[PDB]
Design a protein around this ligand. Structure first.
Ligand SMILES: NC(=O)c1ccc[n+]([C@@H]2O[C@H](COP(=O)([O-])OP(=O)(O)OC[C@H]3O[C@@H](n4cnc5c(N)ncnc54)[C@H](O)[C@@H]3O)[C@@H](O)[C@H]2O)c1
Ligand SMILES: NC(=O)c1ccc[n+]([C@@H]2O[C@H](COP(=O)([O-])OP(=O)(O)OC[C@H]3O[C@@H](n4cnc5c(N)ncnc54)[C@H](O)[C@@H]3O)[C@@H](O)[C@H]2O)c1
Ligand SMILES: NC(=O)c1ccc[n+]([C@@H]2O[C@H](COP(=O)([O-])OP(=O)(O)OC[C@H]3O[C@@H](n4cnc5c(N)ncnc54)[C@H](O)[C@@H]3O)[C@@H](O)[C@H]2O)c1
Ligand SMILES: NC(=O)c1ccc[n+]([C@@H]2O[C@H](COP(=O)([O-])OP(=O)(O)OC[C@H]3O[C@@H](n4cnc5c(N)ncnc54)[C@H](O)[C@@H]3O)[C@@H](O)[C@H]2O)c1
Ligand SMILES: [Mg+2]
Ligand SMILES: [Mg+2]
Lengths: 338, 338, 338, 338
C-alpha cells in the first residue's frame, strides 16, 4: 500500500520535489495527495507548469480549480494555513509530511504536523537541535523506523558528505575546510532589505555574499567520526541555480591527485553509484542543470600538495539534485515504515 | 519651527528619501525624527550606510543603539509595529508621515496614521482611490492644505508626466501609448514564487517580465484633460535600478523630431528646470544613477512619422530621482501647512 | 541529390542553425558538409554539444578530430580562413553558403564565396545594399532562383514583419513605431570596451543599452508598400536570449483590442500557421526559449486608443526562432534551385 | 624631471590606471603623454569619462580631437597600431610603457616596445618566461634599475601575496591552496564563443566558470621561499568587478583564528599599511568598489582547525586596486630610474 504524502511549502524545493515524483511515479511507494502553501491552487498550478529553471512541464497536463491541483488526472488536495497545527492531516490520512517551508526546522515546529495528524515529518533542511539527520548514500541505512521527525540536511551537505566519506575511508581526514560558491536562493533579498543575516540582506544578483553553510556542521552529523573536524563558509553569487563546493583536507595517508581521482571514480561506479558522478569534462555551471547526482567531481581541478593537503571540487544542482535525494529518503522511509 | 516627519517603511524608497534629506537638510523645513519598520535600528542603520546602489554613505557618521539611528549627531527614534494604529505618533509629535511600506495605499489604510496622531500622510505610490495625486512640476501647485492624505504617484508617472505636459501644450496630445523598460523592484520575486501577479511571480534577474505600470492611469490624474487618452505597460528587466520610458503620441499639430526636441529643451531650461533634463549624449542606464531630474530626454532617440506620430524616450532613476520628488513634495506640503 | 551547404562563421546563429538542421534532417533537401570558422573542430564540436542556452545536445553523438566535426556519424569537414576567397568551396562541391560571421553582409563581401566556388549565399543578417531580403511567411515566395546572394533580414524583422503584414491587410498601416526590448548579443561588449557604436561599447550585462534595430528599415523592404512608414529603436537588456517587440501603429480602419487579437489569431491558424503563434498565457521571456514561431503575440497586452492607435507586443527567440527561419529559407532555396 | 609614460592598450586596466594617475597627479614623478590603442581618441575619451563601474569622471574636463585626448588641459597623444615595433616611442621620448593589452606578456613581445624606442616596459600581467615579477609591499624593494621589462603579476597575486607573506613570517607556511571567486573579465565571452580555454568560452554572466589563476604560480615568484608550495584555481562568476580569494594553508606553528586576525591587523597598521586593510564589518562585494588596498581581510571569516590548518578570506577590487598598484610600481621605478 502507498504512503500518502503532503507537501508543506510549495516553493522551489516543494515544486522540484513534486516534479521529481511525477517523473518517477511508476516506481514509487509514495502518493502525493496534499499540499499546504501560502498561495492558492491556481497560482501554484501555474508555477508548477512554468518554471524559469526547469522549463515547461511537458510529461502530463497540469490544471487546477478552487480545491485541487491536477497533474495527469492525479488530484492533489490544496489547503492554505500558515499554522501546521490547524492542517487537516488527520482527515486526509497523511502519512508523511515533506516540510519545505524553511520556518519549521525545529522539533517543536515540525511536531505541530504530528499533533495535526501526520505520522512522520521529513524536513528539507538541517534540523534545529535534536533531530536525526540523513544523507542518502552516506548514512541513510542507519535510519530507525521509530523516528518521527528527520532531516535531509542541506544541498551542500548532500554534495560534500559522499565525497568526504570516500576520502576519509581511503586517506583518513584529520581536518577539513569547505567553501561553496553557491547560487542565490529565496532566503536572500532581491534588493537590499532587512534580514537577520546582514549579508544575505544585500542585493543577491548584484553581489558576492559571504554567509554560513549548513554543511559546516551537518557533514559531521552524518559522518560522526568527523564531528568538530570540518568548517567552512558559503559565497552566494549571481546565478539562479547550480553550485560548486571546494574542499581542502589535511589527510593522514600521503597521496597525489591521480590517486584521489581514482578513488572517487571507483566509488562513483560502485558504492556511490548514482550519488557521486565522476567527470573529466571541462564544463561550467549551466551544464549541470538537472543532473541527478548529489555531487559531480570535477576531476580536472583535483590538486594535492606535499602528500597530505588535498583539494577537490564538486558541482551540484542545489534545487533538483537535492530534491531527488529528498525523494530517495522518503522512499527509504516508506520501505522501512514498520 | 520644523515639520516633524516619520518614515513608515524603511525600504528602498524610505532609505533613499532619508539620504536625500540628509544631503539637503541645510535648506529644509523638515526634520526626520522617527522611523517605523519591520526591522531593528542596528540593521536599518547598517542598510542606510551600506547601499549596493548608492554606495557607502560618506557625509556623516551613521550609528545605532537599541532605540535610535544616529545620522551625524541627529537622532531618529525607531519603533517596529506592523499596525500603524499602534504607532507613537502623538507622543513623538509627528506632523507628517512618509508612507513607504507599499501596503497602506488606500485612504482607510493611510488614515490609520492619523488616528495614531499624525496630521498628514504622503504615500510614496499611487493611491487606491479618492486620494489626490501630485507630480512636482506638473500639478503640485494645486495642492490644497486641507488635504491630509496625498499621493506622489509612481516613478514612471514622475518621468512621463512632465514630458507629456510639455508635449500636450505644444502639440496637443490626442492619444498616447507608453512602455517603460524598467529595472526590477522589491515587489518582484528573486526566484519563481507566489505573487498576485503571475508574471511578477517569476525570477526577476532571469526574465523580461511584462506587467502593469501606474503611469498608465496616473498621468491622466495629474493632467486631467488627458484622462482616458493614455495607456501602456511595463517590461521589468534584470537591472537593479534606473529605467527608461518609451512614449508614442498621436498629436494634433504636425511636427518633426527637431521641433519636438527644441520644445522639450526650451522647457528643460525654463518651466521644467530641474524636472526635465535634456541630453544629446549617447549614454546607457548606468550613467544615470543618482540623477536628480525626474526625466532625462534622450534627444538622439526622438522620432516623428507623418507629422502626427511622435516618439520620445526618457531615462529616470526610479529610486533616487523619485525620492528627490517625494522630498520636494514634502517640502511643499511643509510650506503650505495651513 | 542534395544541396551541399557550408556554414561560414560557427557562432550563435551558425550553431543554432546546425542544431536546427540536425533535428530536421529527415525531411531535408540540405546536407551540411562543411564549416569555416576562426576556431578548430575540437573546440567547435565542444561548443556545438555544450550550449549554455540550448543545453546539452541529446539526439546524436558529437565528436571531432583534426579534420572534421562528427554529428551522429555525419562528417562535417572544417577549415579556418578569415578570407572567404581562399575557402575550398570548389573542392568540397559547396552549393550554398550560410554566411553567419556578421562581417560579409555587403554584396562584394558575400560574393567572395562565389569566387571561391559556391553557387549561392544566404546572409544571416540584413544586407548592406542591393541584396534581396526575405522573411519566410511574408515575401519568401517572391524569391527568384536567379538571385545568388540573399538576406534573411534580422531577428526583429522576422518577428515584426509577419504581424505588420497581417495588421496592414486588415486595418491599413499608415505609420508605425517599434521598440524591441532585446536580449544582448555577441556584438555587444562584456565590459566597457571600444565599439563603433558608443552604447554597444558599454558592459552589456549591467546596462539597458539603446541602439538601432534592423527591423526599422527591413520591414519596409519585405513589405514594399510600407517603405518609409516605419521607424524604431532597440533597448538591449541583461538577458542572454529571447526578446520582445512593442509595435504602435497608426491605422486607417478604426478597431478595438478584441478585433485586433481576433485578426491575428485567425491568421496564426491559417495563412501564418507556424510563423505567428497566438498566446493568451501570462508568461515571461524564459518560457519562450526554443519556441519555433517567428512571433508569439502576447494577446493580453494588445491595446487600442481612439480606434486608430494600435499597440501589439510579440515575443521571439532571437537565436533559435531566427535560425529555424534561416533553415526554412535555405530549404526553399534548395527547392527552387533553377 | 618627469618620467614620460605611454599606455599600450586603453582597456579596463589602461583606463583605470589613467584615472588613478589623474587623481594622484599632484604627487607623481610620472607624466602620461601617449596612448596606443585599437580605437580612436574620441571613442577612448568617451569611455574614459563614462565608465559603468567607476561612474562619470568629475574631477576635470575630458575632450578629444583627431590626435589627442585632453584631461583638464593635459594633452595625451594618441596612436593606433597593433604592432608595437611601429610605435613612435622614440619620437615621443617615451620612458616607460604600461603594457596593458594582454597580448605582449612575453619578453619577445614586450621587447618590441624597446626596439621602437621605449626605455622600460611594465607588463600589467604575469610575465611569460624570464621576466622579473613584483608585488608592491612584498618584494618591490628588490627591483633592480637595470631591468628593462618587469611584471606587476595579476590582481589575485597582489591580493594574496601580502597576506601570504604575513602569515608565512608569523606561522611558517608549509603548503597552501587558493580559490578566488572572481568577477568576470574581458578575457571571457559574453555568449558562448570560441576561446583557447574551453570554460572561458562560455557565457560569462550566466555561469560559474572554473579557470586558472596567475596567483597559483606568481605568489611563489614574489615570495621565493614558497615556490612550488602553493596551488589553486579561479571560479569566475557573474559580477562585473570585485573579487574574493579564499586561502587554506598548512602552517608549522600552532595557532587559532584570533591570533591569525591579530597578526594581519598589526601588519595592516605597520609594515603593510595601505596594502592590506583589516575589516571586521559584514560587507559584500559591492561595498569594496574603489577600495585602494591590495587586499581587505574579512576578519569574520577566518578559521583555524586543529592548530595548523588556517583559512583566511580577502576581498580586492581587481580593476581599481590592481591599477593603484601598477601606478605604485611605476612611481617606484621612476624613483630608482638610475
Ligand atoms: N533552494 C535550495 O537550493 C535548497 C536546497 C536544499 C534545501 N533547501 C531548503 O528547503 C526549504 C525551502 O526552500 P526554498 O528554496 O524552496 O524556499 P521558497 O521560499 O522557494 O519556498 C518556501 C515555500 O513555503 C511557503 N511558506 C512559507 N511559510 C509558510 C507557512 N507558514 N506555511 C505554509 N507555507 C509556507 C512559501 O510561500 C514558499 O512557497 C528551506 O528550508 C531551504 O533551506 C533549499
Ligand atoms: N522602488 C522603486 O523604484 C519605487 C519607486 C516609486 C515608488 N515606489 C513605491 O514605494 C513603496 C515602497 O517600495 P520599496 O521599493 O521601497 O519597497 P521595499 O520592499 O524596499 O520597502 C518597503 C519597506 O516597508 C517595510 N514594511 C512592510 N510592511 C510594513 C508594515 N506593515 N509596517 C512597517 N514597515 C513595513 C518593509 O520591511 C520594507 O522595509 C511602494 O509603494 C512602491 O510601489 C517604489
Ligand atoms: N545572435 C542573434 O540573436 C542574431 C539573430 C539574427 C541574426 N544575427 C546575425 O547573425 C550573424 C552572426 O551573429 P552571432 O550572434 O552568431 O555572432 P557570433 O559572434 O556568435 O558568431 C560569429 C562567428 O563568426 C566567426 N567569425 C568571425 N569572423 C570570421 C571570418 N572572417 N571567417 C570565419 N569566421 C569568422 C566568429 O568566430 C564566430 O564564431 C550576425 O550577422 C548577426 O547580426 C544574430
Ligand atoms: N581586468 C582585470 O581585472 C585585470 C586585473 C589585473 C590585470 N589584468 C591584465 O591587464 C591586461 C588588460 O586587461 P583588461 O581587463 O584591461 O582587458 P581589455 O580587453 O579591457 O583591454 C585590452 C585593451 O588593449 C587593446 N588592444 C588589444 N590588442 C592590442 C594591440 N595589439 N595593440 C594595442 N592595443 C590593443 C584593446 O582594444 C583593449 O582596449 C590583461 O593582461 C589582463 O590580464 C586585468
Ligand atoms: Mg499623419
Ligand atoms: Mg483616432
Amino acid at each position: 500500500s502507498m504512503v500518502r504524502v503532503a507537501i508543506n511549502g510549495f516553493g522551489r524545493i516543494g515544486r522540484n520535489f513534486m516534479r521529481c515524483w511525477l517523473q518517477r511515479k511508476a516506481n514509487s511507494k509514495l502518493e502525493i495527495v496534499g499540499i499546504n502553501d501560502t498561495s492558492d491552487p491556481r497560482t501554484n498550478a501555474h508555477l508548477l507548469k512554468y518554471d524559469s529553471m526547469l522549463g515547461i512541464f511537458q510529461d502530463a497536463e497540469i490544471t487546477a480549480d478552487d480545491d485541487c491541483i491536477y497533474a495527469g488526472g492525479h488530484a492533489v488536495k490544496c489547503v492554505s494555513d500558515r499554522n501546521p497545527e490547524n492542517l487537516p492531516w488527520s482527515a486526509w490520512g497523511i502519512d508523511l509530511v515533506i516540510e519545505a517551508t524553511g520556518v519549521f526546522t525545529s522539533r517543536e515546529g515540525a511536531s505541530k504536523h504530528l499533533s495535526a495528524g501526520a505520522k512522520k515529518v521529513l524536513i528539507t533542511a538541517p534540523g534545529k537541535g535534536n533531530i536525526p539527520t540523513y544523507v542518502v548514500g552516506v548514512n541513510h541505512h542507519t535510519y530507525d523506523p521509530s523516528e518521527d521527525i528527520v532531516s535531509n540536511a542541506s544541498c551542500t551537505t548532500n554534495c560534500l558528505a559522499p565525497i568526504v566519506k570516500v576520502l576519509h575511508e581511503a586517506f583518513g581526514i584529520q581536518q577539513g575546510m569547505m567553501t561553496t560558491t553557491h547560487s542565490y536562493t529565496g532566503d536572500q533579498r532581491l534588493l537590499d532589505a532587512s534580514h537577520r543575516d546582514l549579508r544575505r540582506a544585500r542585493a543577491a544578483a548584484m553581489n558576492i555574499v559571504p554567509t554560513s553553510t549548513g554543511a559546516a556542521k551537518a557533514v559531521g552529523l552524518v559522518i560522526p567520526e568527523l564531528q568538530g573536524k570540518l568548517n567552512g563558509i558559503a559565497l552566494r553569487v549571481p546565478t539562479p541555480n547550480v553550485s560548486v563546493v571546494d574542499f581542502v583536507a589535511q589527510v593522514e595517508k600521503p597521496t597525489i591527485a591521480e590517486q584521489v581521482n581514482q578513488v572517487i571514480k571507483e566509488a562513483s561506479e560502485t558504492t556511490m553509484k548514482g550519488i557521486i558522478h565522476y567527470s573529466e569534462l571541462e564544463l561550467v555551471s549551466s551544464d549541470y542543470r538537472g543532473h541527478n547526482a548529489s555531487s559531480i567531481l570535477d576531476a580536472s581541478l583535483t590538486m594535492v600538495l606535499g602528500g597530505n593537503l588535498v583539494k577537490v571540487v564538486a558541482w551540484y544542482d542545489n534545487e533538483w539534485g537535492y530534491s531527488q535525494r529528498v525523494l530517495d529518503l522518503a522512499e527509504h522511509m516508506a520501505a522501512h515504515w514498520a
